[PDB]
């Protein structure tokens, strides 16, 4: 099953403040109107160059994610788990079960912060570049039942973790979600007077978008 990410998965590409300007950036983005896999639940998926993840399920249903390679005790793995009061992020040679793991030896990284998670849609972007695991997120109300919403909303930086490991595969920890993949695309991003991205053009979507990017206009 597939759904249409009409204009979803756009995030602030850097930490530079901009306002009242159209900025052209080359980065890993979810291509506009791409096919996003619609999962019900819970398989192990490839990470590729980065992952777009979205769900409308409650915080007590989707607990977190595991990122790594062999996802066993042979290598370092990244475990992100939320609970009622906090979020715990660890990198260890975990031996996962089937409450998530039986052992966590050779730990190299630990981080603790506030929780990451008519309905409410939660969107995340996971990137792993030069040893840094970058997470972007957005939380927005939604009135849809069988698909992704239309409209534009940019995702903000949530955390940037100096974990220093390679990620090739990942799995969602459950107690109904969408998965897409990022590609190297050129986007024209529109910043309003408050420095908020309110729109975007995918310069490689169609002839009209190409024209808009060329002329730097919407």
């Amino acid at each position, epitope marked *: 099953a597939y759904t249409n990410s009409f204009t979803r998965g756009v995030y602030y590409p850097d930490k530079v403040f901009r306002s009242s300007v159209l900025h052209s950036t080359q980065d890993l983005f979810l291509p506009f109107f791409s096919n996003v896999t619609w999962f019900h639940a819970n398989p192990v*998926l*490839p990470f*590729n*160059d980065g992952v777009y993840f979205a769900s409308t399920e409650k915080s007590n249903i989707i607990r977190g994610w595991i990122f790594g*390679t*062999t996802l066993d005790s*042979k290598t370092q793995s990244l475990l992100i788990v939320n609970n009622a009061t906090n979020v715990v992020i660890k990198v260890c040679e975990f031996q996962f079960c089937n409450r998530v793991y039986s052992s966590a030896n050779n730990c190299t990284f630990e981080y603790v912060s506030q929780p990451f998670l008519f309905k409410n849609l939660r969107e995340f972007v996971f990137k792993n570049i030069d040893g840094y695991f970058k997470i972007y997120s957005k939380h927005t109300p939604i009135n849809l039942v069988r698909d992704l919403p239309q409209g534009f909303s940019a995702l903000e930086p949530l955390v940037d973790l100096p974990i220093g490991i390679n990620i*090739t*595969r990942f799995q969602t920890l459950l107690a109904a979600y969408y998965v897409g993949y990022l590609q*190297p695309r050129t986007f024209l991003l529109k910043y309003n007077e408050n420095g908020t991205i309110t729109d975007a053009v995918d310069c490689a979507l169609d002839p009209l978008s190409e024209t808009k990017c060329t002329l730097k206009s919407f």
Partner: antibody, heavy 121, light 106 residues
């Protein structure tokens, strides 16, 4: 049900060319990298080529490098192999596959097609 | 390119016998080795990944272990349905390679 169906095999002359295709269904084709593997009559398995999920990066075995080209169309869920300057040594059954690989493709599942015979004579 | 070798190229065994197949890499491939089982006219089936991780649906009589250059595949008690050619494959680096193949018969 996951399926991989090879087609486009047949008999060609030495120095000629043949294009194979593999129709994929039952799985998220555009999320996985894909491989071609061939097996000559009475011989073991030999890896031929690999393409990433976006079709961007391509890798070949030294024995076919410069003669074979790998490509994919993610809108048709179809993998292709274009073989030029075919030699007698290229006679083999060609398979498309998603090989389990924790380092490069990130595939957690192993899928194979039934294979198609290419004869050079 | 990593050269893969297997030994024995062929072995005979009865039902209930213990069967061991050796696979050796010319380079240290850590634990990035797959084991396949192929029967005549069929595509190869994966039995073991990451040197020693068993695939789902694979009988408990199958096992494997090893690290670096020397790996072993074992059938603790050969069954009539285990008559096949076994291959080892490395995916530590590209190009990927398969071993010669070991034929098991009665």
């Amino acid at each position: 049900e996951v399926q991989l169906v090879e087609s486009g095999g047949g008999v060609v002359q030495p120095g000629g060319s043949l294009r194979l295709s593999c129709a994929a269904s039952g799985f998220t084709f555009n999320s996985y990298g894909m491989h071609w593997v061939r097996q000559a009559p009475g011989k073991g398995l030999e890896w031929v080529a690999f393409i990433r999920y976006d079709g961007g990066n391509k890798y070949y075995a030294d024995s076919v490098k410069g003669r074979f080209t790998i490509s994919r169309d993610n809108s048709k869920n179809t993998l292709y192999l274009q073989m030029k300057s075919l030699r007698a040594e290229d006679t083999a059954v060609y398979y498309c596959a998603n090989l389990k690989d924790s380092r490069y493709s990130g595939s957690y599942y192993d899928y194979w097609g039934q294979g198609t015979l290419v004869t050079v004579s | 390119v990593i050269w893969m070798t297997q030994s024995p190229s062929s072995l005979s065994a009865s039902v209930g016998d213990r069967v061991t197949i050796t696979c050796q890499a010319s380079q240290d491939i850590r634990f990035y080795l797959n084991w396949y089982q192929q029967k005549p006219g069929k595509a190869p089936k994966l039995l073991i990944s990451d040197a020693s991780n068993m695939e789902t649906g694979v009988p408990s009589r199958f096992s494997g272990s090893g690290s670096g250059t020397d790996f072993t595949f074992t059938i603790s008690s050969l069954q009539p349905e285990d008559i096949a050619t076994y291959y080892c494959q490395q995916y530590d680096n590209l190009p990927f390679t398969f071993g010669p193949g070991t034929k098991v018969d009665f």
